[PDB]
Amino acid sequence: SDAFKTALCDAYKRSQACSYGDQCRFAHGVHELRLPMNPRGRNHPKYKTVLCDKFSMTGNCKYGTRCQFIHKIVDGNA
Ligand SMILES: [Zn+2]
Ligand SMILES: [Zn+2]
């Protein structure tokens, strides 16, 4: 990354006064801040939202991969 605006200004945050001022290679705000944009794709994206009742009762769900419900192998014997 380039030396400009990829990190916040330590002098501006702690001391407020910055030695270079507006010629500071660091950002004096979030609008000034253009950091190296790392992917935000970390959160869990669920197609299958609620548990599958058919897969829990009969052990089988007819939709399979199409199922909008979570196929969880539930322990316990009848
Ligand atoms: Zn600065
Ligand atoms: Zn299912």
Q: Which ligand is nearest to the CA of 4?
A: 1
**Interatomic CA distance for residues 56 and 39, integer angstroms:** 36
Q: Three-state SS for 62?
A: coil
Experimental method: NMR
Q: How many CA atoms lie within 13 A of 68 on its CB side?
A: 0
CA separation, residue 64 to residues 44, 47, 48 (Å): 20, 13, 11
Please provide residue 51's backbone torsions phi and psi, each rounded to the nearest 5 degrees: -65, 150
Nearest alpha carbon to residue 38 among 1, 72, 8, 68: 1
**In this structure, is the dihedral angle defined by the CA atoms of residues 73, 74, 75 and 78, taken in order, positive or negative?**
negative
- Please check if 31 is assigned to a binding site: no
- Output the six-digit token pair for 22: 């507006």
**Interatomic CA distance for residues 5 and 2, integer angstroms:** 8
Place of tokens 């190296």: 36
Q: 46 CA distance to ligand 2 centroid (A)?
A: 14
**Interatomic CA distance for residues 8 and 28, integer angstroms:** 6
